[PDB]
């Protein structure tokens, strides 16, 4: 962690990049789906009496 | 602490699989029965030192079947060995541990 000095520059560049991407990732979800499951199923109490 | 970054969560996932298992073998019936017994007993005997478990394994193995045996532990690795048939052993145990035992050529 001592040997040289562009350690700081490298971590700064990489870290600002990772910061903005994790920032926007945390901002809003990107992979959900509306109503992924659960169309109702009814067999005994049928919707008709035929 | 909870969730990722903790070994305990992965261990909880892989916990209830604590008994030996394998299905790939050609080597003779009494002799892989004895081999599986000796390796599981050595695993139970030595928990800290995989080296010392390998010691105890290979000492019984070669004292009871002559010289020219080899054996390696692991929980992640790969291998490729030339060998004579009826002599290859490759077992899983603990849910994450693998073993091979074989004859030199």
């Amino acid at each position: 962690e001592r040997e040289e000095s562009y350690l700081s520059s490298c971590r700064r560049l990489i870290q600002q990049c990772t910061d903005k991407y994790v920032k926007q990732n945390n901002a809003i979800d990107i992979y959900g789906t509306y109503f992924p499951e659960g169309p109702p199923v009814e067999d005994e109490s049928l919707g008709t009496a035929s | 602490p909870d969730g990722p970054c903790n070994i305990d969560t992965i261990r909880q996932y892989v916990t209830p699989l604590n008994y030996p298992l394998e299905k790939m073998s050609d080597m003779a019936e009494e002799m892989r029965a004895e081999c599986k017994e000796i390796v599981v007993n050595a695993i139970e005997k030595h928990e800290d030192s995989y080296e010392l478990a390998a010691r105890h394994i290979k000492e019984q193995m070669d004292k009871k079947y002559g010289p020219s045996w080899h054996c390696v532990m692991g929980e992640g690795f790969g291998f490729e060995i030339s060998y004579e048939m009826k002599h290859l052993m490759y077992m899983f145990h603990k849910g994450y541990v693998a073993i091979v035992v074989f004859k030199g050529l």
Partner: protein, 98 residues
């Protein structure tokens, strides 16, 4: 000095715990890890370093005037971001919000 302060600024964000800096020698020292987690540190460092090596090889093979900048990958339960450098590598781990 201020590098740990920047790291804690990063960790202030919701739903994040884990940052790894990897050098050329493969020694993974920069971590939000407790005592027990050297094994997982070695895990992530070695595997992601190999992945980044192959990724950058693929990039310079597919084009000689392009240079890889960033990578993420998903699971059903997790998120992980990785960023390469000419000498170093950064890995951060993020958790899915409901």
């Amino acid at each position: 000095g201020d590098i740990e302060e920047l790291l804690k600024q990063i960790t202030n964000h919701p739903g994040v715990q884990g940052i790894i800096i990897v050098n050329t020698d493969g020694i993974p020292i920069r971590h939000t890890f407790q005592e027990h987690s050297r094994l997982l540190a070695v895990q992530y460092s070695a595997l992601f370093q190999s992945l980044a090596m192959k990724a950058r090889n693929a990039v310079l093979e597919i084009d000689n005037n392009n240079e890889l900048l960033f990578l993420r990958v998903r699971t059903k339960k997790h998120e992980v971001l990785v960023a390469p450098d000419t000498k170093y590598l950064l890995i951060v781990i993020q958790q899915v919000e409901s």
